[PDB]
Chains A and B, each alone.
Chain A
Amino acid sequence: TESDWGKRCVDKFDIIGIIGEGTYGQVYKAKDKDTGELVALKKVRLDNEKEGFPITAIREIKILRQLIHRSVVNMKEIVTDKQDALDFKKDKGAFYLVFEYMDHDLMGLLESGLVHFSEDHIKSFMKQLMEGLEYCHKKNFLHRDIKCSNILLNNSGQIKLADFGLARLYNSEESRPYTNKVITLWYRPPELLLGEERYTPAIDVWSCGCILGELFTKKPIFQANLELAQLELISRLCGSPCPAVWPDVIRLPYFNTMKPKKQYRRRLREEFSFIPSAALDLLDHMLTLDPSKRCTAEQTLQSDFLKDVELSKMAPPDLPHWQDCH
């Protein structure tokens, strides 16, 4: 049946090339021999035998079979290398996680400078992204790593999330120690910069907001190399963490340790005065220092900016495929 995973061989896919470097394996693009469907195969190596099957892959399998949404990347099946079939111990073969094939990644499109996003385009993009985040946040799973590389878009204008490698469930009533360093520094919230280990789902929201600004500027907002420099940049824009706005900042481990150059005032509305009013309000609330005051996904969808967007419209983003040639 369709459910008997891990047995079908990778022979069934014609390998087209290697689309990307992975965490636990290389990512290959392939075509299904039987259907012609283009798939994306991520390789899982248990030959390392340090810890056997990598947990990063275990999370991506465990979670993505449970989560089904139009903005969540679908794992179609798991296939294997040719079987020795005489002794299982000798087998050093590897497994492949079949995913749907997304045409482009958001970082790629911005870094190639080949995209121009109109207000209406950003609405369709952020609506799908935050609707997907809401599905996951309602299922009590946390992405813990949001980045432009991780949001994939088809040329059709559909958006999908594809980084469940660092995902874990969050229990509201029962808080437990979590890994402090979870997001790429550019999209890491102030709480995790100050080291809060019991983090809310709002860590992902901060990241999605960083993207909202990035789509309007085409340049990431907080570009730093070191954790202190990042807190400084965030502080120059959002304001310095202080009990006046973040009453529990004193409870966070590094508040006395990590001070910015000044106690800055928030300028987010001034430095982004070129953004539409509905969007700026979304950005201002998503980029709130206190995670308990930062808006949730459901609230972001019930915003003047994203509420009245028709998902059917799916205005494709603009790509200039022929003009680029010359």
Chain B
Amino acid sequence: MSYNYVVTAQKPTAVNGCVTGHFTSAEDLNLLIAKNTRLEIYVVTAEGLRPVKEVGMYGKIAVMELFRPKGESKDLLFILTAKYNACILEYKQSGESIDIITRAHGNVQDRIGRPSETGIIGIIDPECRMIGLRLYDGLFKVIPLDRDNKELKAFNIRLEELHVIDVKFLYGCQAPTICFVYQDPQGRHVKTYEVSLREKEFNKGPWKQENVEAEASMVIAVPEPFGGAIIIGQESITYHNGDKYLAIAPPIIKQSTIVCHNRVDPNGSRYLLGDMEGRLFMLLLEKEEQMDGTVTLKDLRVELLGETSIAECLTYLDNGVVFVGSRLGDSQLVKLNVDSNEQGSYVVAMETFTNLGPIVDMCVVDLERQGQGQLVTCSGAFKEGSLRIIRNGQKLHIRTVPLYESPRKICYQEVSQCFGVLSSRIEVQDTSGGTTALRPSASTQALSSSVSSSKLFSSSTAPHETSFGEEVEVHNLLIIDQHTFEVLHAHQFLQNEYALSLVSCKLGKDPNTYFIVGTAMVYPEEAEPKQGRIVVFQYSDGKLQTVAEKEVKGAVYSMVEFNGKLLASINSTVRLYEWTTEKELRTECNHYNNIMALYLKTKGDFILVGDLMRSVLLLAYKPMEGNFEEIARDFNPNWMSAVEILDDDNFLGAENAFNLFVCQKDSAATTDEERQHLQEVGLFHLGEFVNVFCHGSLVMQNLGETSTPTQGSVLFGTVNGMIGLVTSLSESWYNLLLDMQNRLNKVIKSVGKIEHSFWRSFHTERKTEPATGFIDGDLIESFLDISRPKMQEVVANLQYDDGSGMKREATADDLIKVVEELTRIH
């Protein structure tokens, strides 16, 4: 068996949702911000946000909504986790003591159901009579909000429309009514139903179904003054109430897909809309009241306000202040002005909240010779793309290096005092026949620049037609200085060439240090790339020189230096190249038993291969024979996102299901089969998407022995900005820390009453297994924060065991030391 420890170094930073209400007091205006597994509660001041409380939940927050049922003084909070844990929460404050109450809880998972494409949707009735949930295709789940439903029991109504895009509870209906956009073979339609708690079935809807834009995306419930709904698409916005139908199709929105909406004025006159290119719009409901006293929606208007960070969620707070919740870039507080500035913008940024964004890749480098270590991340996307320099301070100190284009890979080249970064930017087919970039960015603002002139694929004769307005990716290699982070150079790759891998190393007997990039030729027609290049560059005297190029019949997904040779993955094939005295790559040997060789890692003469679906494989170079051999494969099937080698026997992997596992050699020679069978000895549900595993530590400022029981440092980066660390334990320490977890879980009160053991259970749509071989360090590190009565309760009847005896009981003041030492690895 294997024993490992996993802790969070940086909590998730990306904003996954945000709501406003009166949650802490019936009087205060609250802003609740949801980050993966984290809930942040703020109070809205005139200057900005006053933080008041932050809690963690044993689950990914999928639904977050505030509501106030008749009889309550203040808003209650509903949260549904991605594993279908549902709860109703309350804020209670006794002077200085702040705690969160679990009012109702349960798991709403069905034994049979097909998870929907558009994801979990949760909505609440305007009269707070019920919670609607859209978990599975063909079904609508109702939790009625009666006082006695403390377990959140619920029933399913059969839904004929299998493919639902979005649904909201509409305002101003005689009975609870839902308005949804659905897709069947004839296009998309907007249809309405009425919900009966007494009958437990749908009834005919208030207004006629209409057939809407093919890419109709979002449904807006309009307040009672106007009633009805607004449907947001790619080209048009429409309003559907009864016999009333409006449609505005302003050309400005066609340019970028609108992803978020929020209501500014409670009457419904004004709404906020945001799009993927970061633009912020105002949607205006121009009202014409009729003489009888009725209020009719005369027309809709769209007005461009300015630019924000590409926003996942918007929420208007008060006065001219709006909170921009961003998943791909920094979140913001921006003020909307009545008067435009001299550039024509009504939006002016107030505060910027750091978001490490998606961490596509990262490396650890000792920039200052501190003996420590700094983490340089590829963070963000599109106009939010950036590098982040992260060093341990008690807080982390983070420098931001804006790129305005998407970073893809990073590697450090000490000889050149610079980084090499792979990036891609979006240009659009323009009237010239070429393309035009939406904005300048790192690859266009380099001091010196170059473009590949390779003739390898120039024979073409393969037609790829272009339509005006279509997007394309343009890929570059950026040379960036390690002190200033000036873009010294930018190398643009071939048209339709994607840069997928980057290394910096010396090869063979060649003393030069090179940047080597692995490319794949991507054409929309191809399901799998069939052409690719390995390019050897040299950065010398402020210029990047193309040294050698090797054509390959596939995608060079990953490349790694291997004892002076170049090891690369080309689709299925895994290949080792030698670097000749003629400065050309020469193939030595190949391995072909892979579906798709997405990730590579090495140690000595051993290689670990991460396949798309066939998990991890341990390869070996047999030096005497000059070929690859197969040591052992994980026959259990997993979709892999990143892999790392822990030691010569233990191997770490990350699943696309937000899970982590550890495979070990069986190391028993009773049969060749046991040797060739990698055993999954560790299973752990992380809750984050790991893109990169990297050996190192930022706390190496002490660089000293006698500071940790645990050994090894594997840092990892995730899509939600979370940075974590994995380290190994001895059997004795794990059994101690494990036994302590079980004790802590009985003592610590969970938000939503979610069992910790359930949360960390390995979970895919098809399997659920109890966690094994992993210590949730974030649970262990919470021992220090629990009250003294609880601490002594944890250590009761606890006997520590170790090799060489020492079967003794330990006190709580002993453990406060042990955990404090463990809080030092990060």
* A interface list, Cβ under 8 A from B: 16-21, 26, 29, 107-114, 213, 216-221, 233, 236-237, 270-275, 319, 321-322, 324-325
Contact residue among B136, B529, B673, B765 (Cβ-Cβ distance under 8 Å from A274)? B136
Confirm or deny: B11 has a beta carbon within 8 angstroms of a beta carbon on chain A.
Answer: no
B261-269, B589-597, B741-749: which lies at the A interface?
A: B589-597
B38-46, B190-198, B540-548, B632-640: which lies at the A interface?
A: B632-640
User: Do A322 and B114 touch across chains, with their CB atoms under 8 A apart?
Assistant: no
Q: Which 4 A-B pairs have the closest CB atoms?
A: A17-B593, A274-B138, A112-B613, A111-B637
Given contacts A26-B676, A112-B639, contact A18 B527 (CB under 8 A): no
Of chain A, the residue at the smallest CB distance from B138 is A274
CB neighbours of A233 from chain B (8 A): 111
CB neighbours of A112 from chain B (8 A): 612-613, 637-639
User: Do B630 and A217 touch across chains, with their CB atoms under 8 A apart?
Assistant: no
Given A274-B113, A321-B612, 13 further pairs, Cβ under 8 A: A21-B677, A108-B637, A111-B637, A112-B612, A112-B637, A112-B638, A113-B639, A114-B613, A213-B112, A217-B112, A274-B159, A324-B612, A325-B596
- C-alpha gap A20/B522 in the complex (Å): 32
CB neighbours of A107 from chain B (8 A): 637
Of chain A, the residue at the smallest CB distance from B159 is A274
B window 754-773: CB within 8 A of A: 764-766
Contact residue among B138, B593, B596, B657 (Cβ-Cβ distance under 8 Å from A29)? B593
Q: How far, in Å, is B793 (CB) from chain A's closest CB?
A: 34
- C-alpha gap A216/B115 in the complex (Å): 10
Confirm or deny: B158 has a beta carbon within 8 angstroms of a beta carbon on chain A.
Answer: yes
Beta-carbon contacts of B104-139 to A below 8 Å, as 1s and 0s? 000000111111000000000000000000001111
- C-alpha gap A220/B529 in the complex (Å): 33
User: Do A20 and B138 touch across chains, with their CB atoms under 8 A apart?
Assistant: no
Beta-carbon contacts of B586-612 to A below 8 Å, as 1s and 0s? 000001110010100000000000001
User: Do A237 and B112 touch across chains, with their CB atoms under 8 A apart?
Assistant: yes
Given contacts A17-B593, A273-B158, contact A113 B764 (CB under 8 A): yes
- C-alpha gap A218/B113 in the complex (Å): 9
Of chain A, the residue at the smallest CB distance from B592 is A16
User: Do A218 and B766 touch across chains, with their CB atoms under 8 A apart?
Assistant: yes
**Can you sample 25 A-B contacts with CB below 8 Å?**
A17-B593, A26-B673, A29-B593, A107-B637, A108-B614, A111-B637, A111-B764, A113-B657, A114-B639, A213-B112, A218-B766, A219-B112, A219-B765, A219-B766, A271-B112, A273-B138, A273-B139, A274-B136, A274-B159, A321-B528, A321-B612, A322-B529, A324-B612, A324-B639, A325-B555
User: Do A16 and B593 touch across chains, with their CB atoms under 8 A apart?
Assistant: yes
User: Do B136 and A108 touch across chains, with their CB atoms under 8 A apart?
Assistant: no
User: Do B111 and A271 touch across chains, with their CB atoms under 8 A apart?
Assistant: yes
CB neighbours of A217 from chain B (8 A): 112-114
CB neighbours of A20 from chain B (8 A): 635
CB neighbours of B811 from chain A (8 A): none
User: Do A274 and B139 touch across chains, with their CB atoms under 8 A apart?
Assistant: yes
Of chain B, the residue at the smallest CB distance from A149 is B637
CB neighbours of A220 from chain B (8 A): 766
CB neighbours of A274 from chain B (8 A): 113-114, 136-139, 159, 162
- C-alpha gap A213/B598 in the complex (Å): 32
CB neighbours of A113 from chain B (8 A): 639, 656-657, 764-765
Chain B: interface secondary structure? loop
- C-alpha gap A236/B110 in the complex (Å): 12
CB neighbours of B614 from chain A (8 A): 108
Confirm or deny: B526 has a beta carbon within 8 angstroms of a beta carbon on chain A.
Answer: yes
Of chain B, the residue at the smallest CB distance from A216 is B114
User: Do B613 and A108 touch across chains, with their CB atoms under 8 A apart?
Assistant: yes
User: Do B637 and A322 touch across chains, with their CB atoms under 8 A apart?
Assistant: no
Q: How many residues of B contact A (CB 8 A)?
A: 44
- C-alpha gap A218/B764 in the complex (Å): 11
CB neighbours of A108 from chain B (8 A): 613-614, 637
Confirm or deny: B58 has a beta carbon within 8 angstroms of a beta carbon on chain A.
Answer: no
Chain A: interface secondary structure? mixed
Of chain A, the residue at the smallest CB distance from B594 is A17
Beta-carbon contacts of B672-704 to A below 8 Å, as 1s and 0s? 110011000000000000000000000000000
Of chain A, the residue at the smallest CB distance from B500 is A325
- C-alpha gap A217/B672 in the complex (Å): 38
- C-alpha gap A113/B677 in the complex (Å): 23
Of chain B, the residue at the smallest CB distance from A20 is B635
Contact residue among B598, B673, B764 (Cβ-Cβ distance under 8 Å from A325)? B598
Q: How far, in Å, is B632 (CB) from chain A's closest CB?
A: 9
B window 478-525: CB within 8 A of A: 500, 522
Q: How far, in Å, is B532 (CB) from chain A's closest CB?
A: 13
User: Do B114 and A218 touch across chains, with their CB atoms under 8 A apart?
Assistant: yes
CB neighbours of B596 from chain A (8 A): 321, 324-325
Confirm or deny: B78 has a beta carbon within 8 angstroms of a beta carbon on chain A.
Answer: no
Contact residue among A109, A110, A221, A321 (Cβ-Cβ distance under 8 Å from B112)? A221
Q: How far, in Å, is A24 (CB) from chain B's closest CB?
A: 11
Beta-carbon contacts of B158-182 to A below 8 Å, as 1s and 0s? 1100100000000000000000000
User: Do A218 and B593 touch across chains, with their CB atoms under 8 A apart?
Assistant: no
Given contacts A218-B114, A321-B596, A325-B557, contact A111 B638 (CB under 8 A): yes
CB neighbours of B639 from chain A (8 A): 112-114, 324
CB neighbours of B111 from chain A (8 A): 233, 236-237, 271
Contact residue among B110, B527, B635, B657 (Cβ-Cβ distance under 8 Å from A322)? B527
User: Do A322 and B766 touch across chains, with their CB atoms under 8 A apart?
Assistant: no
- C-alpha gap A191/B816 in the complex (Å): 58
- C-alpha gap A321/B594 in the complex (Å): 13
Q: How far, in Å, is A55 (CB) from chain B's closest CB?
A: 20
Q: How far, in Å, is A211 (CB) from chain B's closest CB?
A: 13
- C-alpha gap A319/B614 in the complex (Å): 15
- C-alpha gap A219/B110 in the complex (Å): 12
- C-alpha gap A165/B114 in the complex (Å): 33
User: Do A19 and B138 touch across chains, with their CB atoms under 8 A apart?
Assistant: no
- C-alpha gap A221/B766 in the complex (Å): 10
User: Do A18 and B676 touch across chains, with their CB atoms under 8 A apart?
Assistant: yes
CB neighbours of B657 from chain A (8 A): 113
- C-alpha gap A311/B765 in the complex (Å): 31
User: Do B673 and A17 touch across chains, with their CB atoms under 8 A apart?
Assistant: no
Contact residue among A18, A110, A216, A322 (Cβ-Cβ distance under 8 Å from B593)? A18
CB neighbours of A324 from chain B (8 A): 596, 612, 639
Given contacts A114-B639, A220-B766, A322-B529, contact A17 B592 (CB under 8 A): yes
CB neighbours of B613 from chain A (8 A): 108-109, 111-112, 114
B window 540-564: CB within 8 A of A: 555, 557
CB neighbours of B557 from chain A (8 A): 325
User: Do A18 and B765 touch across chains, with their CB atoms under 8 A apart?
Assistant: no
Of chain B, the residue at the smallest CB distance from A27 is B635
- C-alpha gap A272/B113 in the complex (Å): 8
User: Do A17 and B677 touch across chains, with their CB atoms under 8 A apart?
Assistant: no
CB neighbours of B673 from chain A (8 A): 21, 26
